[PDB]
Symmetry: C2
Subunit: 48 residues, 2 copies
Amino acid sequence: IDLVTAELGSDWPRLVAPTFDARKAVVFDDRWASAREDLVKLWLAEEG
Amino acid sequence: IDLVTAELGSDWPRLVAPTFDARKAVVFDDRWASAREDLVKLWLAEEG
């Protein structure tokens, strides 16, 4: 492991560490909810 | 070391092993010796 590090360097092994996992995903399929809140904000704040 | 191997593969660490060492070098600076043996071989074997 010392020899492998000697060739590749310090940053390469540390940055190659895994990140992605299947449980952290977030899905936004709602327009219906966000469109309603979007309109009332316009309606109340109307100036121009 | 298992994670590092997982990324890079099996062949990469094995082929990257060191080879060169300063003590195995071989120097041929002699023409004077090799030219003499070269001529006598011609002289004896002359046909054409």
